[PDB]
């Protein structure tokens, strides 16, 4: 397989505008949402059809109860943070947990928290400790590190349980996640040379420009890999032409183990 990942996010908002949830939690396999929960629906629900078809109602019922609890825990943790920061108004709290199964068979695991969108506490599952970015986090770090069994629990979840979930979901969604749709690549002028690719899956792609067989990333404008809306992606890269010298320009595209070169005449 290619590299794959599983991650769950949580978002807490302390004083949300009317209608918007104080708490949301979404799971992803790669770029695919698989699960959602929020404080308005109070239900955990699938976000991919291959999750709904392979997880029995007992699964959604049980994690719905756990997420009702995690929602309350997030409210209490955010209240404590905003009091220690002495902050008024609406502030955000975020959590991300997950793991990766690399192509070569190795694994990574990660867990971190953010306050107002900035890193706040970052877990190191090898040294079994929390990295704190300021003195509010330093206070939380001491409290969390006092509970050694919970650090051990998180290391086991990240290294064993998460990877097991990931391989289970990869099998459920294999027709989606393990397919390959090659890009359709074209070049035009607008003076700058544009190289445009669309129709591809997975979204991981590398497009670059070479001049006389040499690459120079400083001279290249790299566009983002964007969702096309139909399950595939598109990207582009541009480079400006030198009218003072004759040079051979070529677009190079790398996708899922295939390399492609488009020579500009």
């Amino acid at each position, epitope marked *: 397989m290619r590299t794959h990942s599983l991650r769950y996010f949580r978002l807490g908002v302390s004083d949300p505008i009317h209608g918007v949830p104080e708490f949301i939690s979404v799971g992803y396999v790669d770029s695919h949402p698989i699960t959602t929960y929020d404080s308005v629906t109070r239900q955990k629900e699938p976000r991919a059809p291959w999750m709904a078809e392979n997880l029995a109602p007992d*699964h959604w*019922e*049980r*994690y719905t*109860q*756990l*997420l*009702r*609890g*995690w*929602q*309350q*825990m997030f409210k209490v943790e955010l209240k404590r943070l905003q009091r220690h920061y002495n902050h008024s108004g609406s502030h955000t709290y975020q959590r991300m947990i997950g793991c990766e199964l690399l192509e070569d068979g190795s694994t990574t695991g990660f867990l971190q928290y953010a306050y107002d969108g900035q890193d706040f506490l970052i877990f190191n599952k090898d040294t079994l400790s929390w990295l704190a970015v300021d003195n509010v986090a330093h206070t939380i770090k001491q409290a969390w590190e006092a*509970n050694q*069994h*919970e650090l*051990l*629990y*998180q*290391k*086991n*979840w990240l290294e*064993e*349980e998460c990877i*097991a*979930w990931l391989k289970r979901f990869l099998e459920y969604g294999k027709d989606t996640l393990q397919r390959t749709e090659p890009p359709l690549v074209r070049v035009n002028r607008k003076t700058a040379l544009f190289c445009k690719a669309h129709g591809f899956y997975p979204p991981e792609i590398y497009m670059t420009w070479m001049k006389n067989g040499e690459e120079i990333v400083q001279e290249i404008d790299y566009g983002d890999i964007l969702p096309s809306g139909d399950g595939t992606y598109q990207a582009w890269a541009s480079i400006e032409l030198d009218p003072q010298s004759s040079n051979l320009y070529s677009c190079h595209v790398e996708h899922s183990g295939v390399h492609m070169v488009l020579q500009v005449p």
Partner: antibody
Amino acid sequence: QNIDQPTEMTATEGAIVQINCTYQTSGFNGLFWYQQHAGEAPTFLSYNVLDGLEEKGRFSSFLSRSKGYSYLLLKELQMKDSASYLCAVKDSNYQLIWGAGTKLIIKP
Amino acid sequence: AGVTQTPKFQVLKTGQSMTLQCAQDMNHNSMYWYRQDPGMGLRLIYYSASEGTTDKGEVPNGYNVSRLNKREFSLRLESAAPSQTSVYFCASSVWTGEGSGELFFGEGSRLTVLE
């Protein structure tokens, strides 16, 4: 999902006894041991989630995740150790599966 | 006080109603009702992962529960049956969706239901 531990064990005061617990579960989020004196409430003894041995006073608890095996080790047995010992495992959905308990009888 | 459940003992005729009370003063979020029967491990009847939510356990038939507030979780036998003769334990923990946190048990309620 299944947890197994012997029904009853008898050892002598001052000696050592090892209470075994084997489990097969859908995933693993830790193994607990509880003590329950006859007619009383269970109380927490130990938690293991990574492999190896952990010590707490006269009690130690061992876990092997690959073997799906734990033991609770009681040394220098006293009459007050006569009780039932319950093993419990949290599975992938954080549900506790409970063993039926081992009744430990101590001979003075 | 920890976990306080009542009553310690109760005799019931088949069809009679009964409510078991449980309160915890440890500011725990999660509460549980178990039954204990000889020859088997503890079986969860209902649980309450947080204030304002409850759900069935493994043996919910014949029972209902009410999480009245953060402290209190009562168990109701609307129409007692002999099969509900058992010892009942209420328990609480700080949270449910975590790994290492232990349970704290009440003293137990011994119920005998007779025809």
